[PDB]
């Protein structure tokens, strides 16, 4: 790897610089290098990894949707729209495969605490969900089940080990509800999960400090926003 010669601490420092510079491809490469040092990641380091790859794949997802819409409308201009949509699709799949590779070698198996294990399993669900968004052939069903299985394991741990206001637990429930609605064609499961998550978090807000209250209520507003859209 191109970052094998750089100190772990230097990789983390440069990831933070790249975030400030809005250089998210660089930030992702730096954090990939940090993960490959083999040590477990702190909560702040997991945030750097998450921010970097979410921004990279988010740009690819946005581009893919633009190109897929143009392609759908065209279906004569020749093969160029399909070719270029396929190009972006393959790059997107490559990023998802890279993230899933880091999680499987060996972030998840070394994650023993609830916050680390739930965060990584949520990540695994998210990047399979992104693969599912572009999947069509004999692989779409297996990709969807891989996302479901990762999210479900994360949910089982989070319900046993975290309070209902924990932001990792809340963001996991939010993303699993999006999975149900957008990917698995299960809007009623999505709505049920969103409502139950919101209501249990509401009842636990009284236990929080002002700083944790801010974090929990932000994700709860997103659950509400989706419920408004879905109903």
């Amino acid at each position: 790897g191109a970052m094998g010669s750089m100190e772990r601490a230097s990789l983390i420092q440069k990831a933070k610089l790249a975030e400030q510079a809005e250089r998210y491809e660089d930030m992702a490469a730096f954090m990939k290098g940090a993960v490959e040092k083999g040590e477990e990641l702190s909560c702040e380091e997991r945030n750097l990894l998450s921010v970097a790859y979410k921004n990279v794949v988010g740009g690819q997802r946005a581009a893919w949707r633009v190109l897929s819409s143009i392609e759908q409308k065209s279906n004569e201009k020749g093969p160029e729209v399909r070719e270029y949509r396929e190009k972006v699709e393959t790059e997107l799949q490559g990023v998802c495969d890279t993230v899933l590779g880091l999680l499987d070698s060996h972030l998840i198996k070394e994650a023993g605490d609830a916050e680390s294990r739930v965060f990584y399993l949520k990540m695994k669900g998210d990047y399979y969900r992104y693969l599912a968004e572009v999947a069509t052939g004999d692989d779409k069903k297996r990709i969807i089940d891989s996302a479901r299985s990762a999210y479900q394991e994360a949910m089982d741990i989070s319900k046993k080990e975290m309070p209902p206001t924990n932001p990792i637990r809340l963001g996991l429930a939010l993303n699993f509800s999006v999975f149900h609605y957008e990917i698995a064609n299960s809007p009623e499961e999505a709505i049920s999960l969103a409502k139950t998550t919101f209501d249990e978090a509401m009842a636990d807000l009284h236990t929080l400090s002002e700083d944790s209250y801010k974090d929990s209520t932000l994700i709860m507003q997103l659950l509400r926003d989706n419920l408004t859209l879905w109903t």
């Binding site: 945030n47 998450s50 979410k54 921004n55 939010l174 993303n175 957008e182 997103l222 926003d225």
Partner: peptide, 9 residues
Amino acid sequence: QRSTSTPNV
């Protein structure tokens, strides 16, 4: 309109 997933901090 698309559903909202968890944002970046």
